[PDB]
Write a protein that binds this ligand. Structure first.
Ligand SMILES: Nc1nc2c(ncn2[C@@H]2O[C@H](COP(=O)(O)OP(=O)(O)OP(=O)(O)O)[C@@H](O)[C@H]2O)c(=O)[nH]1
Ligand SMILES: Nc1nc2c(ncn2[C@@H]2O[C@H](COP(=O)(O)OP(=O)(O)OP(=O)(O)O)[C@@H](O)[C@H]2O)c(=O)[nH]1
Ligand SMILES: [Mg+2]
Ligand SMILES: [Mg+2]
Ligand SMILES: [Mg+2]
Ligand SMILES: [Mg+2]
Ligand SMILES: [Mg+2]
Ligand SMILES: [Mg+2]
Ligand SMILES: [Mg+2]
Ligand SMILES: [Mg+2]
Ligand SMILES: [Mg+2]
Ligand SMILES: [Mg+2]
Ligand SMILES: [Mg+2]
Ligand SMILES: [Mg+2]
Ligand SMILES: [Mg+2]
Ligand SMILES: [Mg+2]
Ligand SMILES: [Mg+2]
Ligand SMILES: [Mg+2]
Ligand SMILES: [Mg+2]
Ligand SMILES: [Mg+2]
Ligand SMILES: [Mg+2]
Ligand SMILES: [Mg+2]
Ligand SMILES: [Mg+2]
Lengths: 120, 401, 109, 205
RNA sequence: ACCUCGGAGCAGAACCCAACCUCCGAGCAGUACAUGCUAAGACUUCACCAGUCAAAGCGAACCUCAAUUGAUCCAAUAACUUGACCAACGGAACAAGUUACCCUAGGGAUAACAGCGCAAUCCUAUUCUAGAGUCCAUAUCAACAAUAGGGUUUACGACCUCGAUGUUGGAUCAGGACAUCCCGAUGGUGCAGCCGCUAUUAAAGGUUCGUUUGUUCAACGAUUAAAGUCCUACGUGAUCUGAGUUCAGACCGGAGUAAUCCAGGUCGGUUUCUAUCUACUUUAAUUCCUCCCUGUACGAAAGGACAAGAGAAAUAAGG
RNA sequence: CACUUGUUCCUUAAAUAGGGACCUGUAUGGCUCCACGAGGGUUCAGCUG
RNA sequence: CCGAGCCUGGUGAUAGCUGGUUGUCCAAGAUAGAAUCUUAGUUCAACUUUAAAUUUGCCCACAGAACCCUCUAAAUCCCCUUGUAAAUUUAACUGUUAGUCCAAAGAGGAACAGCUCUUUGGACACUAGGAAAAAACCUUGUAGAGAGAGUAAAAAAUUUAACACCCAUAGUAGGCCUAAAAGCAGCCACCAAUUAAGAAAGCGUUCAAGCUCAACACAAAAAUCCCAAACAUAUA
């Protein structure tokens, strides 16, 4: 019978080689995930459909910010084959009230708080 | 597989023969014997009602009886049906039992084909019972399809199977002729060893040839394949003994005649050797049975006339008494076989003077059996006493004038 | 040749898993054999069903098994047990939540 | 008794209850009779299948005839046929109950030893007819000595260690990457893609 | 054969799971007479009906078993209570056969023919090297088995068609495959020659007439160079035939009380269609035999050739 | 007495067709074809697309 | 137009059976079983729709759910947090309850079927792209116009068998065995000479003899007619 898959915990224990490859320090982990649905929930189990709806990833290629916490991570583990997860980067820090209207999420995963649309 | 059988022998030795037949099955055990006399062998019930009721009550009272072996050549369909209904167990006759042992022992494709031909009558007899589970009540109301009914279709299929078997057996006969071509061309004398079942044909051939691969079994109908083994006679002549299938009495002729494809090697034999089991109480009946079986097989009349006889199993107790296992009269038997092959194959034992040069002596060695060579060095020649066939003599006369 | 075997499932098993608030009289688990044994504040019916004798929380534990001395089969099993061996069984417990009652001032005589 | 023992067609006490065809007994790697015992050569099953009394007779006759009894000995590493296989009458429509017991087989799983030979001989003397038997077996089989079996196991381990493919069936199946467990079987999590039905892919890493 | 109820696998771990699936069982028995009355809260066979457990309380002492059964109405009884192997077991209060004399509504939800899936069965080829073949696996075969291929048999499935896909054979015309029966070329041979056997290649051409039987088949007669295996809607009924099968009539044998039926035998028994569309409608031959070689080669004899040449015919095509 | 189990004879070159015998078992309503028949089979000779 | 006439009437007989069931537009909408003279139907359940009341609904952390059985699957139930916004209840209803393939666990069959039967899930009974055409495989879904753009899945790979050359005297025909059995029918031992040779590993001999060897020396085929055309070398 086809059932829900229990991912062994060893899969989610990064190695030093993984750290070097993907550029992430085990200490000081990132706070937020940018998650984009890159796969259709069609032809996938209803539980994956429901998890996608819960995470609010109904539209494909639409980034969504999520907490990097154990429960959200469990849901993302359930639907990990349909999504792309990246760490949200804040080169200029968190947006403030003043610059809340000038933000932009660049394809690199950086939320720039000044968007001038002018040459550097 | 496993069968406990009650041996019901009608009467008008044979019990011992039927017991041996049962034992041959390797899983069939005789658990009861009933010799019952009757004056009407041909009837729906072979026995008069007085004996029939006693047999029925005895059989049904005995619970170990899985089947009954009626020592009759072949029981008709009504007789089988009535006996089955009365005795509440399966009924087997000589035909069925012999057919079963033939099927069990048959190992070669030729033997399997021949026993299938032998079975064909059994399949025809049991057609109704073998197809009763396929009727499904379909016929005469379904308005389309071939006009053949269920039984007509089954009979057609059985006939087609029999035709296939007969075609295959004809091909086998052709192939056997092809195989015999070479031995016939090189003029090997052929002696076909025939006789009653279990009379010692295989053992005698083993004793004569000296082969060790020959395995004379204790069970009946051990040899189901016609096979040729070479041996040497006192005259240094090589003779080919053909071991054949044994014959049984009170058995349908068709069963054995189904083996004619492989038994035709007997017809092309130069001599026939009847192995009489003299120790057996019914040796005379065995002789009658085997002679009738050979006549049915249509062996050449000259060959049947020239048939030699050897009394095997003489140790247990005009001809040559022999003991195959002990090996008592083998040398004598070989002497008479030598004489018989000389007078049958048209081989002349003659002295022949040859110049000791030109390879005439080597030619004579290779194309004839040089019994002896007396050499005259003064004339530089040799007189060879040799057993030479007519063809070899003609070849020599032309080659070396 | 094979007749019968058409009986449906008894729908037996645990009705209240651990941590479930249970009111007095609730059936905790229905069983054909003694899978879970009665614990504190848990009663057994004629058909071996476990019902809550008090209002509280269901807890499943593993506790040593000491049959009644008149339970001949269990006593024989124990008599045949090697020294040092202790049987264990799963027991169902109801940890009562509310107190039996409170003392209230009813009249200031 | 150096020569190989005779094997009966069916158990002496015949089974009465028809039992389901649990093909799992053929499927997957073999966990029994996987190591040599009192012998140096054997026939290894590189696949799953059922051995009939016909196969047993073939093995017995060939090995007995081709061996040297005074310098070689052979022993079965597979039990006599015990699993009953039932066949209905020819021409029978579907239904009407399970068929009557027809034959007995012995399940064999890939990686198991079928016959084991030993004695004062080397591999080359026996590999010939062991390979004949293996080729005539119902499943893929190979005549293997202790040394050759260890060599092939070490070769498999070496291939697993030095494979340059970043992606392995084991990794992908265990992590459920791409959601491939929707297409795989629960058995695949332990077969690691090296087994497919009764077939054992040996080159598969 | 089964129809209701329970236990165990399938269904390994909360629950639940089909099967004309594998196995076991039940239609009670026994002990007590508080086997009394009441009452929170729960379970529940996937509905309902029904079935389960039960604290506390009154009253008393100081129920075993898995199933072990059945509603309403209606009867008997003063009442309490009792009543169906209603087992087709959610139970019509009480009703069987046969229909080819049949009819109607439908069904390709479902059979017969056909197609199609499958290849158990069937056929074929290789592999092993046991065994036949005097010796010799491999001239020819070939057991136990293994691996492949085909879709001609017997089957199974029920996917199209029951507001019709007309049915077995035969006539007529034939199209195609080659796994070749003959004619052609070649290798081997247990090929001395003639007959042969086997294998590779070859589908241009050909592959008979009759007695019996509806015979497709089969037996037989006479031939042939051969009288090939198949597929084509078991090719071909808007081209034909209807002898069988397979309507309504009637007998004989069997079954039944009978109607009537039967995988028994038989005598008789309506064969429609004027063509709208597609398609199509004038495209260097084979073989046998006689003679000669030659009674030669070959062969101990018996028997008996190739190749080359000559002559005769037959069929087919075209005139 | 009738019908059934097998063997055989005539008829044809050839017959699962037609006719005639003998041989095994079943079963006061069974045998007997004189004449007749668009009845069902077999056949000599002739005839003829 | 007689298995029982015809006409009229009851009569618009009845039909769980077939067929038909007529404006526009939007929205929700495929889902366990039980009983049934019942499996071509219906009632209840489940699902579905609408409106209303209320508050928890789904996902799910530990902890927890059996021995029989020695071991043993994917998993399941329960479940705070968390991500989400749905859930239960009330009122009123219909319709679906003759289903297909795919992956997986199995059963029956023959470890056949486009076969049949359960379970988990998917898809189809809805749009679109792809796998050639294509219900069930892969991608992808919420809908309009555009003569813009980035992508998803998405194109099969393979070509396979040569091989040693030279040389051989001999204790003896090792014993027993057997008529003989001589390296070679079988059993025992299997030593030993020549620099170099097994009391012999296969042929062959009735038996011998003659041959070697070891030893020195230096993949496939079926029926109307194969089936895009082609292409090895211009920088992912
Ligand atoms: N006492 C004794 N028995 C003998 C003799 N000859 C043969 N036998 C036995 O008779 C039986 C015959 O066996 P085979 O010789 O194989 O039989 P066959 O003659 O081939 O006959 P089938 O078994 O029918 O093929 C065996 O038990 C032999 O041992 C003899 O001279 N004396
Ligand atoms: N509960 C119950 N009712 C019955 C029983 N026997 C008969 N009845 C009632 O009577 C009906 C059956 O009628 P019948 O079959 O004629 O009964 P009977 O007793 O055999 O014969 P009569 O007395 O002639 O009616 C049922 O449907 C009930 O109404 C029974 O055993 N139990
Ligand atoms: Mg014999
Ligand atoms: Mg059950
Ligand atoms: Mg309920
Ligand atoms: Mg009912
Ligand atoms: Mg009639
Ligand atoms: Mg009608
Ligand atoms: Mg059909
Ligand atoms: Mg259909
Ligand atoms: Mg179906
Ligand atoms: Mg139409
Ligand atoms: Mg060809
Ligand atoms: Mg007609
Ligand atoms: Mg007429
Ligand atoms: Mg007629
Ligand atoms: Mg017409
Ligand atoms: Mg005629
Ligand atoms: Mg009228
Ligand atoms: Mg109406
Ligand atoms: Mg909508
Ligand atoms: Mg969109
Ligand atoms: Mg050498």
């Amino acid at each position: 019978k086809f059932t829900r898959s229990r991912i062994p915990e060893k899969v989610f224990q990064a190695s030093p080689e993984d750290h070097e490859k993907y550029g992430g320090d085990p200490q000081n982990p990132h706070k937020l995930h940018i998650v984009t649905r890159i796969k259709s929930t069609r032809r996938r189990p209803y539980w994956e459909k429901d998890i996608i709806k819960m995470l609010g990833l109904e539209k494909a290629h639409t980034p969504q910010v999520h907490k990097n916490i154990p429960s959200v991570n469990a849901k993302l583990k359930v639907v990990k084959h349909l999504i792309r997860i990246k760490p949200l980067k804040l080169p200029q820090g968190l947006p403030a009230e003043e610059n809340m209207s000038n933000t932009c999420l660049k394809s690199t995963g950086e939320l720039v708080v000044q968007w001038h649309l002018k040459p550097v | 597989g496993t069968q406990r059988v009650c041996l019901v022998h009608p009467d008008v030795w044979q019990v011992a023969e039927a017991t041996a037949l049962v034992h041959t099955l390797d899983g069939w055990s005789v658990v009861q014997t009933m010799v019952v006399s009757t004056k009407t062998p041909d009837r729906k019930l072979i026995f008069g009602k007085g004996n029939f009721e006693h047999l029925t009550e005895k059989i049904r009272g005995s619970p170990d009886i899985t089947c009954v072996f009626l020592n009759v050549e072949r029981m008709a369909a009504p007789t089988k049906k009535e006996l089955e209904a009365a005795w509440g167990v399966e009924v087997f006759d000589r035909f069925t039992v012999v057919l079963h042992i033939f099927r069990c022992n048959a190992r070669t494709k030729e033997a399997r084909l021949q026993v299938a031909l032998a079975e064909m009558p059994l399949h025809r007899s049991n057609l109704k019972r073998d197809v009763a589970h396929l009727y499904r009540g379909v016929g005469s109301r379904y308005i389309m399809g071939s006009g053949e009914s269920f039984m007509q279709l089954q009979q057609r299929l059985l006939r087609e199977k029999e035709a296939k078997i007969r075609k295959a057996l004809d091909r086998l006969r052709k192939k056997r002729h092809l195989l015999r071509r070479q031995r016939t061309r090189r003029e090997f004398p052929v002696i076909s060893v025939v006789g009653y079942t279990n009379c010692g044909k295989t053992t005698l051939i083993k004793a004569l040839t000296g082969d060790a691969a020959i395995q004379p079994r204790d069970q009946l109908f051990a040899t189901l394949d016609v096979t040729a083994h070479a041996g040497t006679l006192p005259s240094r002549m090589t003779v080919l003994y053909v071991d054949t299938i044994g014959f049984l009495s009170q058995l349908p002729h068709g069963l054995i005649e189904s083996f004619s494809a492989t038994l035709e090697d007997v017809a092309h034999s130069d001599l026939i050797l009847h192995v009489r089991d003299v120790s057996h109480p019914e040796a005379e009946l065995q002789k009658c049975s085997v002679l009738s079986t050979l006549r049915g097989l249509q062996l050449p009349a000259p060959l049947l006339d020239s048939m030699v006889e050897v009394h095997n199993k003489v140790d247990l107790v005009n001809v040559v008494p022999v003991s195959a296992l002990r090996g008592h009269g083998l040398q004598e038997l070989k002497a008479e076989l030598d004489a018989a092959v000389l007078k049958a194959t048209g081989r002349q034992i003659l002295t022949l003077r040859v110049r000791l040069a030109g390879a005439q002596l080597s030619w004579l060695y290779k194309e004839a059996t040089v019994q002896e060579v007396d050499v005259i060095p003064e004339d530089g020649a040799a007189d060879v006493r040799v057993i030479i066939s007519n063809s070899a003599y003609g070849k020599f006369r032309k080659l070396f004038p | 040749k094979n007749l019968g075997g058409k009986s449906s499932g008894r729908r037996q098993g645990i009705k209240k898993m651990e941590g479930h608030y249970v009111h007095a009289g609730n059936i905790i688990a229905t069983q054909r054999h003694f899978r879970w044994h009665p614990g504190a504040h848990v009663g057994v019916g004629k058909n071996k069903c476990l019902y809550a004798l008090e209002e509280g929380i269901v807890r499943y534990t593993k506790e040593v098994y000491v049959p009644h001395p008149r339970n001949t089969e269990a006593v024989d099993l124990i008599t045949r047990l090697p020294k040092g061996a202790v049987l264990y069984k799963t027991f169902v417990h109801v940890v009562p939540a509310k107190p039996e009652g409170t003392f209230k001032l009813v009249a200031m005589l | 008794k150096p020569k190989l023992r005779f094997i009966e067609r069916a158990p002496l006490v015949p089974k009465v209850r028809r039992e389901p065809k649990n093909l799992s007994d053929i499927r997957g790697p073999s966990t029994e009779a996987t190591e040599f015992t009192e012998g140096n050569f054997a026939i290894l099953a590189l696949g799953g299948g059922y051995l009939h009394w016909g196969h047993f007779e073939m093995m017995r006759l060939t090995i007995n005839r081709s061996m040297d009894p005074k310098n070689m000995f052979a022993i079965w590493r597979v039990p006599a046929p015990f699993k009953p296989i039932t066949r209905k009458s020819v021409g029978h429509r579907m239904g009407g109950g399970k068929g009557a017991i027809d034959h007995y087989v012995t399940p064999v799983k890939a990686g198991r030893l079928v016959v084991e030979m030993g004695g004062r001989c080397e591999f080359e003397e026996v590999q010939g007819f062991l390979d004949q038997v293996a080729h005539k077996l119902p499943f893929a089989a190979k005549a293997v000595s202790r040394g050759t079996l260890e060599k092939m196991r070490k070769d498999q381990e070496e291939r697993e260690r030095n494979n340059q493919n970043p992606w392995t069936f084991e990794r992908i199946a265990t992590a459920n990457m791409l959601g491939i467990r929707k297409v795989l079987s629960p058995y695949d999590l332990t077969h690691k893609g090296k087994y497919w039905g009764k077939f054992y892919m040996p080159k598969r890493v």
